[PDB]
Design a protein around this ligand. Structure first.
Ligand SMILES: [Zn+2]
Ligand SMILES: [Zn+2]
Length: 64
């Protein structure tokens, strides 16, 4: 898990989409992200480089 997580210290950019809860990483925050096709899943934090398998992966999160 990690602990009691919520929007505290974290800046989430709209354009570069970089997100850091670590205050040191906001001081080192460098806006410039080549974000072609990458989708992070909340629980399965490993990023998917494809949209189609991601859609089938959401079907895996869908109940009956
Ligand atoms: Zn940024
Ligand atoms: Zn997932």
């Amino acid at each position: 898990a990690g602990g009691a997580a919520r929007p505290l210290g974290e800046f989430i950019c709209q354009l570069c989409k970089e997100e850091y809860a670590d205050p040191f990483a906001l001081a080192q925050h460098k806006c410039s992200r080549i974000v072609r096709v990458e989708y992070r899943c909340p629980e399965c934090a490993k990023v998917f480089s494809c949209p189609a398998n991601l859609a089938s992966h959401r079907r895996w999160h869908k109940p009956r």
